[PDB]
Ligand binder design. Sequence first.
Ligand SMILES: Cc1cc2nc3c(=O)[nH]c(=O)nc-3n(C[C@H](O)[C@H](O)[C@H](O)COP(=O)(O)O)c2cc1C
Ligand SMILES: Cc1cc2nc3c(=O)[nH]c(=O)nc-3n(C[C@H](O)[C@H](O)[C@H](O)COP(=O)(O)O)c2cc1C
Ligand SMILES: Cc1cc2nc3c(=O)[nH]c(=O)nc-3n(C[C@H](O)[C@H](O)[C@H](O)COP(=O)(O)O)c2cc1C
Ligand SMILES: Cc1cc2nc3c(=O)[nH]c(=O)nc-3n(C[C@H](O)[C@H](O)[C@H](O)COP(=O)(O)O)c2cc1C
Lengths: 109, 109, 108, 108
Amino acid sequence: GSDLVSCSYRSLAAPDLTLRDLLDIVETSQAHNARAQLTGALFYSQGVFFQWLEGRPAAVAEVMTHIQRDRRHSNVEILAEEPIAKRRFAGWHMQLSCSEADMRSLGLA
Amino acid sequence: GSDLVSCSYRSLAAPDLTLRDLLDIVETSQAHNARAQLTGALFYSQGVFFQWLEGRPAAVAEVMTHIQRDRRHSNVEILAEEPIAKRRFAGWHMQLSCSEADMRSLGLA
Amino acid sequence: SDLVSCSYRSLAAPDLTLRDLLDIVETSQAHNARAQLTGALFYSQGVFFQWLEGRPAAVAEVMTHIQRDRRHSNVEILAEEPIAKRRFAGWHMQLSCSEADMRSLGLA
Amino acid sequence: SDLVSCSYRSLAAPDLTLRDLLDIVETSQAHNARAQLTGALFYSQGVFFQWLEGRPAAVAEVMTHIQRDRRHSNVEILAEEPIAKRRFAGWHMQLSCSEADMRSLGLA
Ligand SMILES: Cc1cc2nc3c(=O)[nH]c(=O)nc-3n(C[C@H](O)[C@H](O)[C@H](O)COP(=O)(O)O)c2cc1C
Ligand SMILES: Cc1cc2nc3c(=O)[nH]c(=O)nc-3n(C[C@H](O)[C@H](O)[C@H](O)COP(=O)(O)O)c2cc1C
Ligand SMILES: Cc1cc2nc3c(=O)[nH]c(=O)nc-3n(C[C@H](O)[C@H](O)[C@H](O)COP(=O)(O)O)c2cc1C
Ligand SMILES: Cc1cc2nc3c(=O)[nH]c(=O)nc-3n(C[C@H](O)[C@H](O)[C@H](O)COP(=O)(O)O)c2cc1C
């Protein structure tokens, strides 16, 4: 609605990140983002995360304080809140992008 | 080279198939197909497998006798050997196709 | 208790383009929604695999069209099975197409 | 001991097409192979995220071109980090682009 903001960041996955860790992150994010009216997209490849999160300012800032402390990634490199006129990922609580090749290495680890 | 054949089949995944089962299949297939000069593609979605396997007749037929007995799928619905003029998936021992959504359900199970 | 699936493999027309693939998918979304068909289309390196599910009569009807479609040939020993329930509910036609294949089809 | 990465997020031109995306990727394969750059390009719903890695001088050079490229805007607080080793060796530019986004860009 009226007040909508986006947050974008790039982080580095913990060296020991497993496939189960990624699925945990995604399941956790589905449940919470749906309750908090947060949407966006999570991209994972070869130890690199990129996330776009969108919603009201408070929900975005509250979820980001937790994401920054999460021990499954480091070097969280943030882009200040940008005002947005409308959601880009409406109905996607957290859309995952993860190739078969990344699935294979995360699993075989 | 000279004598090349393809084999195509559709099967139904075991109801209890996990993400680990899929990764096992794929790892197993990478190692063997590279030794036996077999190439192709494996597609998985929502309890359905499709595979294209290609190489010399003997390697193709030997690997298929094992795939048919594999308890991780059933109802293996085969297409007789087709002669092919050249490989379609050269250098791909077993290319996997598996969406994020299928990764999520296989994991959350 | 009245669902059937049809499964086949075909070989794409050698001159198939990314536009052709997109058209196939957009046409299928539209007819399948209307005819209560669901399923999955896989494309890689000149090969189609398709799983189609619905009422016998609806599956039979699209298949007669699909089989004569000129964007593929060698539509093969189509495998027809009764099913207890849909595998692809919600998916009028789910496309599977890798970035590498998108790039290849795109090369025109 | 002489590798750097540049990471940014940008917003695609509203009129971006699938052809535009394909061109970007084909251009990048070619220059990146030659300039010893590797990395990953992610596209979804009007948003680019890119990770680029290589020697400082090569990363600096493409970035000046990428930043003025008209197929995107709001090229954002590009995040520049020294790295111990490449994350995307072998990938001159790996594209990530879902079937749903391919369909959308295709709608022209
Ligand atoms: C890369 C990454 C992205 C994440 N994205 C979200 C998210 O979008 N929404 C969310 O609620 N938690 C997300 N998390 C998880 C949160 O950091 C944190 O774990 C959350 O507060 C509760 O999850 P937990 O119960 O596992 O600690 C993410 C974690 C990582 C490492
Ligand atoms: C859907 C599916 C596809 C498979 N594809 C191959 C394959 O292409 N190459 C191969 O060597 N084994 C493949 N397998 C595994 C074989 O059936 C069989 O397991 C193999 O002989 C040895 O694997 P195992 O040591 O786990 O039994 C496949 C299994 C399944 C269920
Ligand atoms: C590999 C392949 C798969 C197809 N799958 C479907 C499908 O599931 N549903 C459908 O309506 N058309 C499908 N088509 C397209 C049909 O062959 C046919 O073009 C369409 O039903 C008629 O299009 P029109 O009546 O709008 O002109 C497929 C075509 C190809 C080549
Ligand atoms: C989102 C985005 C990412 C790009 N990434 C690269 C890249 O990694 N390497 C590259 O050479 N060009 C990349 N480009 C294209 C460059 O901006 C520029 O067009 C190119 O270097 C010059 O093309 P030309 O000299 O062949 O005409 C990218 C463009 C966009 C919009």
